[PDB]
Amino acid sequence: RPRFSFSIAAREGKARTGTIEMKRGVIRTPAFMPVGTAATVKALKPETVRATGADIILGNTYHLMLRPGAERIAKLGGLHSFMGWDRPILTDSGGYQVMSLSSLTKQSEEGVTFKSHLDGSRHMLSPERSIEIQHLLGSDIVMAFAECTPYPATPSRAASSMERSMRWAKRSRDAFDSRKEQAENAALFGIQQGSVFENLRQQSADALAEIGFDGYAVGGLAVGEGQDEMFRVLDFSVPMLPDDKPHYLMGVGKPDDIVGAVERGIDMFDCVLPTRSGRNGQAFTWDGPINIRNARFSEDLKPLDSECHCAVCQKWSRAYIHHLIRAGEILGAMLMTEHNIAFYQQLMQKIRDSISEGRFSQFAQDFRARYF
Ligand SMILES: [Zn+2]
Numbered sequence: 221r222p223r224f225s226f227s228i229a230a231r232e233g234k235a236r237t238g239t240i241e242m243k244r245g246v247i248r249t250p251a252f253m254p255v256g257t258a259a260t261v262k263a264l265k266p267e268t269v270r271a272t273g274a275d276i277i278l279g280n281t282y283h284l285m286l287r288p289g290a291e292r293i294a295k296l297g298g299l300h301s302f303m304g305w306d307r308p309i310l311t312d313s314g315g316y317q318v319m320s321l322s323s324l325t326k327q328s329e330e331g332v333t334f335k336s337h338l339d340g341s342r343h344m345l346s347p348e349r350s351i352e353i354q355h356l357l358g359s360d361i362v363m364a365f366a367e368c369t370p371y372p373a374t375p376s377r378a379a380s381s382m383e384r385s386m387r388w389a390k391r392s393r394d395a396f397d398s399r400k401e402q403a404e405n406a407a408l409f410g411i412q413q414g415s416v417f418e419n420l421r422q423q424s425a426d427a428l429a430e431i432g433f434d435g436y437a438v439g440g441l442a443v444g445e446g447q448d449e450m451f452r453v454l455d456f457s458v459p460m461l462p463d464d465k466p467h468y469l470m471g472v473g474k475p476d477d478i479v480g481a482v483e484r485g486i487d488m489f490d491c492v493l494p495t496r497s498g499r500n501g502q503a504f505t506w507d508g509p510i511n512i513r514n515a516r517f518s519e520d521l522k523p524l525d526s527e528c529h530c531a532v533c534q535k536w537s538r539a540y541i542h543h544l545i546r547a548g549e550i551l552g553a554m555l556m557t558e559h560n561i562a563f564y565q566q567l568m569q570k571i572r573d574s575i576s577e578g579r580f581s582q583f584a585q586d587f588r589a590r591y592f
Contacts, residue, residue: 221241221243222241222242222243223242223243223404223405223406223407224240224241224242224407224434225240225241225242226238226239226240226249226434226435226464226465226466227239227240227241228464229576230575230576230578231575232574232575232578232579232580232581233483233580233581234458234459234483234484234485235250235482235483235484235485235575235580236249236485236487236575237249237250237571237572237575237576238487240435240466242308242360242361242407243360243405244300244306244307244308244309244360245275245276245307245308246275247275247276247308248275248568248572249466249487249488249572250478250482250486250487250488250489250568250571250572250575251275251276251487251488251489251568252274252473252478252489252490252491252564252565252567252568253274253276253277253278253310253488253489253490254269254272254274254277254278254490254494254495254561254564255277255278255280255490255491255492255495256277256278256279256280256303256305256309257280257283257492258280258283258284258287259279259284259288259293259299259302259303260303261277261495261557261561262495262496262498262499262553262557263495263498263499263550263553263554263557263558264495264554264557264558264561265304266303266304266305267304268558269305269561270305270307271531272530272558272561272562272564272565273562273565273566273568273569274307274561274565275307275308276307276308276309276310276360276361277305277307277309277310278309278310278311278312278490279299279309279310279311279312279357279359280311280312280314280317281311281312281313281314281317281350281353281354281357282312282314282316282317282318282321282322282345283317284299284353284357285314285342285345285353286336286338286339286342287338289342290352290353290356290357291356293356293357293358294356294357294358298357298358299311299357299358299359300358308360308361309357309358309359309360309361310359310360310361310363310409310490311354311357311359311361311362311363312363312470313350313354313363313364313365313366313392313411314345314350314353314365315332315345315350315365315366315367315368316368316471318332318334318345319332319368321337322334322335322336322337323335323336323337323341327367329384329387330346331344331345331346331347331349331365332344332345332346333345345365346365346391347364347365347388347389347391347392347395348391348392348395350365350392351364351365351392351395351396351399351402352395352399355399355401355402355406359406360405360406360407361406361407361408361409361434361435362396362402362406362407362408362409363408363409363411363437364388364389364392364393364396364408364409364410364411364433365388365391365392366385366388366389366411366413366439367381367384367385367388367413368381368413368439368440368443369381369382369413369414369415369440370443371415371416371440371443371444371445372444373415373416375417375420378413378414378415378416378417378420379417379420381413381415382413382414382415382420382423382424385411385413385424385439386413386423386424386427386428389410389411389427389428389431389433390431392408392410393408393410393431393432393433396408407434407435408433408434409433409434409435409436409437409466409468410428410431410433410435410436410437411428411436411437411438411439411470412424412425412428412436412437412438412439412440412457412460412461413439413440414440414457415440416445416449416452416453418453418456418457421453421456421457421460422460425457425460425461426460428461429461429462433465434465434466435465435466435467435468435488436461436462436465436466436467436468437467437468437469437470437488438453438454438457438458438461438467438468438469438470438486439470441453441454441469441470441471441472442469442470442471442472442477447474447476447477447480450472450477450481451480451481451484454469454480454481454484454485454486455484458484458485458486459485461485466487466488467485467486467487467488468486468487468488468489469481469486469488469489470490471490471491472486472489472490472491473489473490473491473492473493473494473564474491474493475504475564475567475587475591476587476588476591476592478567478568478571479567479571479584479587479588480584482571482575482580483580483581483584494557494560494561494563494564495557495560495561497509497560498553498556498557498558498559498560498561499553499556499557501513501545501552501556503524503525503541503556503559503560503563504525504559504560504563504564505524505525505528505563506525506527506528506590506591507590507591508591508592510524512524512538512541512542512545512556513542513545513546514542517538517539517541517542518539518542518543519539520537520538520539520542521537521538521539522537522538523536523537523538524538524541524556524559525559525563528559528562528563528566529562529566530558530559530562530563530566531558531562532555532556532558532559532562533559536555541555541556570583570587571583
């Protein structure tokens with residue numbers, strides 16, 4: 221019922237489990253958010269995404285501004301109504317994908333100018349335009365627009381990028397607050413930057429806290445630094461963020477990454493891996509990933525995973541899915557994606573339950589031992 225309320229029900233070390241209440245629904249944390257790129261979670265109906273256990277999905281802001289357009293979606297009734305998802309939706313600011321998928325990007329203090337990677341050039345993106353598009357889409361959790369620092373990054377380079385991003389965080393905050401309808405029904409998350417330097421991360425955390433946000437995301441990770449560095453950065457960075465607000469690790473999603481990130485205080489995750497790898501033929505299992513296309517699965521009657529309770533594993537065999545994927549059948553992508561998302565949601569439920577029971581450390585340990 222509230223606009224935003226985060227409650228921690230249990231803790232174990234730096235790990236915590238709880239819930240976030242929003243007008244459109246309750247989000248159980250730690251949470252994994254399936255990625256909906258072009259107003260759709262690849263190959264799945266919204267009801268199927270909900271069926272796997274998802275409480276919230278992530279909407280793509282760069283993609284949607286290009287096709288079908290933020291203004292058009294708003295006219296059509298908003299993203300929820302457009303795609304058929306009535307629960308909360310977190311929208312990325314668009315800044316990351318602009319710098320990764322756009323042609324001839326132009327950085328400035330005002331924002332970024334770019335060329336759409338597909339048809340001319342839906343062009344300008346600033347902190348206020350980003351917040352505006354996110355409002356138009358009707359997202360529940362709005363992300364402040366930032367400048368992600370590439371890996372590696374020199375201290376001065378990481379500093380100047382972080383400094384700009386903090387200036388953009390203030391502008392994002394003001395832009396969000398000027399829109400009453402948005403400020404009254406949505407939440408705004410700030411994004412910590414600073415690369416792998418803790419002094420920079422500390423400065424970013426303090427600026428962010430000074431402005432004030434509903435939740436804090438840890439940005440700049442999962443950009444090539446490797447799990448060891450990622451984890452090392454998480455170790456000192458997470459404690460810098462307000463304890464009473466959710467901590468969101470953007471773009472992190474390998475099963476092992478999530479488990480180690482939760483041990484470090486992270487409450488929210490998003491990644492294209494489950495959906496992406498599904499289309500590619502990689503299925504996640506408690507004993508590690510398997511590539512269903514491999515000949516050894518040609519006559520395997522067992523489900524993708526023997527403990528998984530998803531509809532796919534209850535009704536189809538590896539042999540059939542192996543056939544579908546090798547034949548390039550759409551049902552293959554549908555089945556594989558549904559299982560993978562189901563697998564991720566089950567992993568989050570096992571994480572939440574073990575934290576509430578005070579046995580997460582053992583779970584993590586047992587998980588890694590079997591998964592690898
Ligand atoms: Zn399954």
